[PDB]
């Protein structure tokens, strides 16, 4: 029979990533794994039909079943509202999910030996732990229409006092203003997730803030990270001959730029978004990256495809024209999610399947079979001929062909 | 007879970059240029002694004389306060001077033909325009001691809209919160500075925000840039076959990493700080970069060393002085442009050529030697110490100026 997968929360996406999402299930997953799939359509039209409530419901389902796999989704702008006749410009589904689940988003490049790096020195991988809560991505911003006073206040729950901070006094014209926050318990979980990842990988840990300018806001990050390290992880880091050190964000980017990789980089929410694409593009391809949210409870995770929905290929697919879409990021979202499922269920067979699918993906590309984007990384786009790459279905066919071989060879071992 | 330099405002710095600052004046500037130098000791000890008033006075002198050159300074924190026994944890001198002067900080790599780039495709130079006003670098942040409400409010001086927004309701434990702002007029001057720089260099311009998430805050940047572009600059951009487009910040870093350079990168205040080190390190060395604040009045300029006061610190040292030198040359070059001073303009350009020619001839400091061969495979024979490299530059500056005098 097939492998007893377990309960997995699925989040369907938009445009070309939704087409690839179904190809992965039909060709690579379902033929070998039986899943209790709790499907939530996070497509832009079902989010619009439910007033974005399906997004919140999918997050609660991940809390209940501990495993979620997410397809890439559209964050609508002004043009998207016109295109789909949306009722509202719905907020980012990833922001809503991360705000509900909390935790740390760990991102790392998907390395193939034949994909050229842009940073030649990065001979070892760089893992970024993105704090998935607060800051710019859960803030209150507004337009200041004219002269006036913008203030930010804090009132303790006991109501015994009240502190009013002056943000700015607009004396001529208007502008913008915003307020953002972060939570002590969220920063402490963010620290523990960062220290444990450095111990499981054997690499040093670096936290990047700007506490020289944000003395109180970022100073909380530096103090919490430093307090937890000295009390619970100091001797453990010294045992594995590693370390933890705080860095200014501007110095950290340049430090990582000229390093040789091999370290954990704990980033605040906004820096994690910016610099993970900096790392992904530096290793070769922006789309060759994993993105797994690790919740503070230590049992719930959300694996996702972090790139876009590839609109240009979706337009070609609807006109029946040939496309060449890279599915690796969407594939590794399934494997990373199924791997954690097998860890929680002690499923030896599901764990072997997830790792085997990741091997087949890497081995197929390293054998010379790849989509057009990966061929352009090697030969350069103006030098890419049609015989240099495979289309969307040819590449999925090659993966399923090689996955079927590797899984069959493993059966002949009893 | 030396060159009549004119009135220049000087800002002295901290630690090693202060030592280099005096060596540049002693060995490169003073022997050839006579200056009405307005000196302001922005050292951490004198800032503490004057309760940071010397920083505000220096910023105001820049308004009056239109040209200032700044040495790298210490921004104190907890470890620095205990070190110098400071009264307060003084704010950044650059944050104060920029908040007073306003304008755009343009940063660009100092290119030497024999320095290897970490990003191979970058064959054309990238120029970052940093909005020097507002955002996290002029914000109000604080620690939330416990449960309670954090609200942000806008009270109009003449209007009917006393609006209150809930920032967050802390229900368990405490945390942190902050409020920040920006100004329409400052964003507009930031827009014009970006469009005009792209037309003077003949390159396309890109603006990076995160307006998909910060719809109102960052949407204002994108709307103001697009409105000024369509009304006052789109025809000129099409004439030179260049363009302006808005990008998301995370998409923009990956696009720039994958590009071949040759564009202007309009950056918000925080991104301008982070990404300018990303660009400088990608072109080779973090300390080979110019940083000039251009004020919106089109005549006031502040040149600085973009890096720090030598983080990594009677022995010999070998420390790169190029960025500090170009702070002087860019300042004197603008001092000469304002004064129509041809001799001063020639001296400023000659010193920059001497600096690049010396490095391209094999004479360089230890960091640049480690750039070409790697630090572990670097010996004393591969570099010059601090005093020898400065003497080598002065030896070549005396030669270049003597050659031009006999022509
Ligand atoms: N985290 C998330 O869920 C994110 C979602 N998005 C959403 O994605 C949508 C489109 O974003 P956009 O900026 O246009 O980026 P796209 O994903 O559309 O990518 C732009 C171009 O890159 C190439 N490309 C990207 N991904 C692949 C792939 N897997 N295989 C092959 N080629 C690829 C294609 O180039 P070519 O045409 O030359 O073949 C494509 O036209 C938006 O609605 C946005 O909100 C965006 C970013 C993150
Ligand atoms: N005045 C200003 O504008 C600035 C002031 N500062 C202040 O400086 C201090 C430290 O700053 P910080 O951001 O930590 O670090 P720095 O900006 O001083 O530089 C960090 C690293 O970059 C490399 N580097 C920088 N400048 C040079 C150079 N000229 N030649 C060769 N290599 C160079 C060195 O790398 P490696 O270790 O590999 O040799 C150095 O360790 C603080 O007090 C801070 O407030 C910081 C930034 C700007
Ligand atoms: C929640 C804000 C950050 C998420 C954003 C995609 C999105 O618009 O949801 C992004 O660039 C990323 O996935 O890193
Ligand atoms: C508020 C401006 C902060 C600038 C900072 C240096 C500092 O003052 O600490 C920095 O590294 C730079 O951008 O040059
Ligand atoms: Ca991103
Ligand atoms: Ca900096």
Author numbering:
A (entry chain A): 3 to 416
B (entry chain B): 3 to 315, 322 to 415
The authors write:
pmcIsocitrate dehydrogenases (IDHs) catalyze the NADP+- or NAD+-dependent oxidative decarboxylation of D-isocitrate to 2-oxoglutarate (2OG, α-ketoglutarate) and CO2, and NADPH or NADH. Variants of isocitrate dehydrogenase (IDH) 1 and 2 (IDH1/2) alter metabolism in cancer cells by catalyzing the NADPH-dependent reduction of 2-oxoglutarate (2OG) to (2R)-hydroxyglutarate. The most common mutations in metabolic enzymes in cancer are somatic mutations in the IDH1/2 genes which are found in >80% of low-grade glioma and ∼20 to ∼30% of acute myeloid leukemia (AML) patients. These active site variants still catalyze the conversion of isocitrate to 2OG, albeit at a reduced rate, but have a substantially enhanced ability to reduce 2OG to the oncometabolite (R)-2-hydroxyglutarate (2HG), a reaction only catalyzed very poorly by WT IDH1/2. Interestingly, all the potent IDH1/2 variant inhibitors active in vivo bind allosterically at the IDH dimer interface; their selectivity for IDH variant inhibition arises (at least in part) due to disruption of Mg(II) binding which has a larger effect on binding of 2OG than the isocitrate:Mg(II) complex WT substrate.
Crystallization trials were initiated to investigate the binding modes of the 2OG derivatives. The R132C/S280F IDH1:Ca(II):4 complex structure reveals that 4 binds at the 2OG-binding site, consistent with the kinetic studies. Note, it was not possible to define the absolute configuration at C3 in 4 complexed with R132C/S280F IDH1, due to the resolution of the structure (2.35 Å; note, we refined and deposited the structure with 50% occupancy of each (3R)-butyl-2OG [(3R)-4] and (3S)-butyl-2OG [(3S)-4]; Polder omit maps of the data refined with solely one enantiomer are shown in Fig. S7). Furthermore, NMR and mass spectrometry studies confirmed IDH1/2 variant-catalyzed production of alcohols in the cases of the 3-methyl–, 3-butyl–, and 3-benzyl–substituted 2OG derivatives; a crystal structure of 3-butyl-2OG with an IDH1 variant (R132C/S280F IDH1) reveals active site binding.
